């Protein structure tokens, strides 16, 4: 079947210009291999998802752009394979575009 949800999506580094993100691979794979994951993210005064890679990532980071200054964001991350698009993961704590420091 399609895979399972990633776990733990965690937050690297964030920025003003890019916010990096990290995930764990989910515990089962329904008999294919995964072919890779897709990224979204969400404002968190909105309910708006938005798709952030336009191809599949391989591994388990990616740099989010397209940002606003100051305001907030949540991510989750969906995993795939041959038969289809699994479940998405739970939401991430909220993290917002500045500079550190």
Same mark, same amino acid.
């Given at each position: 079947?399609?895979p399972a949800?990633?776990?733990?999506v965690? +937050?690297?580094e964030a920025?003003?210009?890019?916010?990096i993100?990290?995930?764990?691979?989910?515990? /089962?794979?329904?008999?294919?291999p995964?072919?890779?994951? #897709?990224?979204?993210?969400? %404002? &968190?005064?909105?309910?708006?998802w938005?798709? +952030?890679?336009?191809?599949? /990532?391989? #591994?388990?980071? #990616?740099p989010?752009?397209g940002l606003?200054?100051?305001r907030?964001?949540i991510?989750? /991350?969906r995993? &795939?394979?041959?038969?289809?698009?699994? #479940?998405?993961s739970?939401v991430? %704590?909220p993290?917002?575009?500045?500079?550190?420091?």
């Amino acid at each position: 079947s399609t895979p399972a949800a990633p776990l733990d999506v965690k +937050c690297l580094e964030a920025n003003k210009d890019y916010i990096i993100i990290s995930w764990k691979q989910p515990a /089962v794979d329904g008999g294919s291999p995964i072919l890779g994951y #897709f990224i979204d993210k969400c %404002e &968190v005064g909105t309910d708006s998802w938005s798709q +952030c890679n336009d191809t599949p /990532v391989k #591994f388990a980071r #990616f740099p989010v752009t397209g940002l606003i200054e100051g305001r907030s964001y949540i991510f989750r /991350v969906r995993a &795939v394979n041959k038969m289809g698009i699994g #479940f998405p993961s739970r939401v991430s %704590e909220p993290v917002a575009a500045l500079d550190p420091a």
